[PDB]
């Protein structure tokens, strides 16, 4: 039931880690794109 915690490693790939990363990247990109447009 916490099988995914048994010997927990880490992967920039399963499903959802590479989503979280892709989204976090697009959002940072967005923010920088916007800030050069405010000041």
């Amino acid at each position: 039931p916490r099988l995914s915690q048994y010997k927990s490693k880490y992967s920039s790939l399963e499903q959802s880690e590479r989503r979280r990363r892709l989204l976090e990247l697009q959002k940072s990109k967005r923010l920088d794109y916007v800030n050069h447009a405010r000041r």
């Binding site: 920039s12 590479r18 892709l22 697009q26 967005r30």
Partner: protein
């Protein structure tokens, strides 16, 4: 012909005979649903009919009234409510009357009762229901079957029913459940059904638990139940104790000492694995709740206020007695390993780990001695246990206390990597990997690195369960080495580092591992690609020569899968081709990163050309898969504006991804890609916007769309606005009203699965307005003024912000976004904004809160905004 005859044919092992029967019933339900159900309920209710016909009828009823699909469900619920109240009254009478008159094992009536209840309870249409179910259980003359089938009905209702609908009748529900669990109850079957219903029900016994009289009554019945001689009841009761600890931790203090500690410790020592697992989970779950309480305590302290909920540190108190139980359990390894099977040994490891992170330092001195006793035991079960326990405590205790212990453990650990037991070598690799993850200084040491590297290199050729952890260890080692080199001291990226000497051997060995034929076992292949990926990213510049070679190999493999996919033979072939493509594409997202941009270009054009070919063939054969779109994003990141060359060809495949709303994951990636295309193509995206914008709004009409697509679509509206500026006027009206509505959404916190969809979506709204306000205004202008079209909306956007300020529930991401918006308004609409802002003291408070960082720059945005309002004075 006759309904009964048809019903009995639905279980025929003949395909056509099963088809005729099913179509008959289908069209019957279409020609006169009300009369069909009434007749069906009559069959179910009559013990005179065969078990087959009654069960079949029950199934036809249940399926008319629910389904796994939430949207189809709500639909069936409304079709039911629209039926003549007299017909429904008759069905309700028969279904209810069937309870206890079935010889069948699991009652077919229970699910029909629940199906109708879920529809009718939220509108008080079945006032007869509860009191009838309560009577069926509490009546001392009720048979086992009557009580069992009823308790199951109760259980199905608590489970399927909308969460908000059942509190007014918790009092009655609990009366029946508790009565069914009492130990005097003769039937274990009844006790089991009752105890399972309690579990389903706890979600709304809030008002009951706040009454010592009732709380005390509930806890005694559950605790006694953990002593039932029927193992199934023991387990279900323990399951309840675990859930009660999660929802009512506040009340537990009077039961832990005197009851719960003993019950759960005894369960842990049980020889019945099912029981041991509940005892262990109970104490892993206490660790989780208490780690969460510590974060609450910590945050409340930084706010000059006491926390709303306080920890009693039960894990810390129990630790003495937990650990000796857990280390012994680590000795019960299952010799035939199944990386998809759960047992007491594995649960014990996770539990030890959670105790380490929950109680930190405390734990070391309870575990060390077992470790030093058994690290060299001739019995592999104990040798492995010792190494496992060592790895479990590497996170939590102060690294300053662990370093000395880890360094003195290296010599033995390096030896254990060659232990004759495969079980031991599996754990040694993980423990080594976790040293590299958590305490790299020990491994990046002038003493041990050389021999450690030799072990890891050889381990890549070992059995899958060993090579897989070795891969993870390598990537961890690579990250540490990289960081170590470039904390600083040199500039932009590191010139060399301790892995450079063997970087070439590692990549080729990893490239080999990727390709092993047993690569599917123990997640090997994925681990190998993850590791290659991570090591290529985390590499020094003097490793480029090896990096280029590896990239030529990856493209080679990718080019190969891609053309393999325009010639598919089977759905098995279909599946694996996409799985490799998935890994290779993900790998591509790091190599393209990490070459010369000049080279990244030549690679981008070549890959995109191959994907478009794959798209042309692959799909309309089940396509588009999602990682291909994410693949395109990274490709658009490199080509930037130079991607315009493929739009005319990619366009349709963009659409099919946007249109596919059933696979919200594919749609989601399509949406994000649109945002990436905006920043890349910018103004040049205009000639594509109508098609996209049209598909976006369409999707927003809605609602078997996923929750999660809307906020992203809103965010992208902002990007589109930023990319096309004035050309957005065309969409301005529809978008603002869409934003208007999504802003007014205000889910009430007793739930958290909504508190942080509310923020996910609010933030989205703010990014939307920001992209619009900045999109309509200006850089090197002639005069300004499109924005003035939004001027009349300022009042509302500010109100939306003001409402966000009141809600204690702030995600930093939202405070920031809200601050950036305020600054935008000041710069866009000017000194009228001031009067409106000073009219809402909560806005002032929101900005201050942002001037303290978390995150970083929530503080900059909050700082900027504070400044803009000030200059307006």
């Amino acid at each position: 012909m006759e309904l009964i005859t048809i019903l009995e044919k639905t279980v025929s092992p003949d395909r056509l005979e099963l088809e005729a029967a099913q179509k008959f019933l289908e069209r019957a339900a279409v020609e006169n649903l009300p009369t069909f159900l009434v007749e069906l309920s009559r069959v179910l209710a009559n013990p005179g009919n065969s078990q087959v016909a009654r069960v079949a009828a029950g199934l036809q009823i249940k399926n008319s009234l629910t389904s796994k699909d939430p949207d189809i469900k709500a639909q069936y619920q409304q079709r039911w409510l629209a039926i003549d109240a007299n017909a429904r009254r008759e069905v309700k009478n028969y279904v209810l009357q069937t309870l206890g008159t079935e010889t069948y094992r699991p009652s077919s009536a229970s699910q029909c009762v629940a199906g109708i209840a879920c529809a009718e309870i939220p509108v008080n249409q079945w006032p007869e229901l509860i009191p009838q179910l309560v009577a069926n259980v509490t009546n001392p003359n009720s048979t086992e079957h009557m009580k069992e089938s009823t308790l199951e009905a109760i259980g199905y209702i608590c489970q399927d029913i909308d969460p908000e609908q059942l509190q007014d009748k918790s009092n009655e529900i609990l009366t029946a459940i508790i009565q069914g669990m009492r130990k005097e109850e003769p039937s274990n079957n009844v006790k089991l059904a009752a105890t399972n219903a309690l579990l389903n029900s706890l979600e709304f016994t809030k008002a009951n638990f706040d009454k010592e009289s009732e709380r005390h009554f509930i806890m005694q019945v559950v605790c006694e139940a953990t002593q039932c001689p029927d193992t199934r009841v023991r387990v279900a009761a323990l399951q309840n104790l675990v859930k009660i600890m999660s929802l009512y931790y506040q009340y537990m203090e009077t039961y832990m000492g005197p009851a719960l500690f003993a019950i759960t410790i005894e369960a842990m020592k049980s020889d019945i694995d099912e029981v041991a697992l509940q005892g262990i989970e109970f104490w892993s779950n206490v660790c989780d709740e208490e780690m969460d309480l510590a974060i609450e305590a910590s945050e409340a302290a930084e706010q000059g206020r006491p926390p709303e909920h306080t920890s009693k540190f039960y894990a810390k108190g129990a630790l003495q007695y937990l650990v000796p139980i857990l280390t012994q359990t680590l000795t019960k390894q299952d010799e035939n390993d199944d990386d998809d099977d759960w047992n007491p040994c594995k649960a014990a490891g996770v539990c030890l780990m959670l105790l380490a992170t929950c109680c930190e330092d405390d734990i070391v001195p309870h575990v060390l001695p077992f470790i030093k006793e058994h690290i060299k035991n001739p019995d592999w079960r104990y040798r492995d246990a010792a190494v496992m326990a060592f790895g479990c405590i590497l996170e939590g205790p102060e690294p300053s206390q662990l370093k000395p212990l880890v360094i003195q453990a290296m010599p033995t650990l390096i030896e254990l990597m060659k232990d004759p037991s495969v079980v031991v070598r599996d754990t040694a690799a993980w423990t080594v990997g976790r040293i590299c993850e958590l305490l790299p200084e020990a491994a990046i040491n002038d003493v041990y690195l050389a021999p450690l590297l030799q072990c890891l290199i050889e381990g890549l050729s070992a059995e899958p369960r060993v090579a897989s952890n070795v891969c993870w260890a390598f990537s961890s080692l690579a990250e540490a080495a990289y960081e170590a080199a470039d904390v600083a001291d040199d500039q932009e990226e590191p010139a060399t580092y301790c892995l450079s000497s063997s970087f070439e051997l590692i990549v080729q060995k990893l490239l080999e591992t990727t390709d092993r034929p047993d690569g599917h076992q123990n997640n090997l292949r994925s681990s190998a690609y993850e590791s290659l990926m991570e090591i290529v990213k985390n590499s020094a510049k003097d490793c480029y020569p090896a990096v280029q070679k590896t990239t030529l190999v990856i493209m080679e493999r990718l080019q190969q899968v891609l053309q393999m996919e325009s010639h598919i033979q089977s759905t098995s072939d279909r599946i694996q081709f996409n799985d490799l493509q998935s890994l290779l594409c993900a790998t591509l997202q790091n190599v393209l990163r990490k070459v010369q941009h000049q080279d990244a270009l030549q690679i981008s054009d070549v890959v995109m050309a191959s994907l478009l070919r794959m798209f042309q063939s692959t799909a309309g054969s089940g396509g588009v898969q999602e990682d291909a779109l994410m693949a395109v994003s990274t490709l658009v990141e490199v080509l930037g504006g130079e991607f315009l060359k493929y739009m005319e060809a990619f366009k349709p495949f963009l659409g099919i991804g946007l249109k596919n709303y059933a696979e919200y994951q594919v749609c989601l990636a399509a949406v994000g890609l649109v945002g990436d295309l905006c920043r890349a193509l910018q103004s040049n995206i205009i000639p594509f916007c109508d098609e996209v914008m049209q598909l976006l709004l369409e999707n927003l009409g809605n609602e078997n769309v996923h929750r999660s697509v809307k906020p992203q679509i809103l965010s992208v509206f902002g990007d589109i606005a930023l990319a096309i500026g004035g050309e957005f006027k065309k969409y301005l009206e529809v978008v603002l009203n869409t934003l208007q509505q999504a802003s007014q959404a205000q889910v009430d916190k007793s739930d958290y699965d909504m508190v942080d969809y509310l923020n996910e979506l609010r933030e989205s709204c703010l990014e939307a307005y920001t992209g619009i306000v900045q999109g309509l205004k200006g850089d090197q202008e002639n005069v300004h003024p499109d924005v003035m079209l939004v001027q009349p909306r300022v009042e509302f956007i500010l109100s939306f912000i003001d409402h966000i300020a009141g809600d204690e529930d702030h995600t930093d991401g939202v405070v920031a976004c809200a601050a950036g918006l305020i600054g935008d308004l000041c710069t866009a609409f000017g000194k009228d904004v001031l009067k409106l802002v000073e009219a809402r003291p909560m806005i002032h408070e929101l900005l201050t809160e942002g001037r303290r960082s978390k995150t970083n720059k929530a503080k900059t945005l909050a700082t900027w905004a504070t400044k803009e309002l000030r200059k307006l004075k």
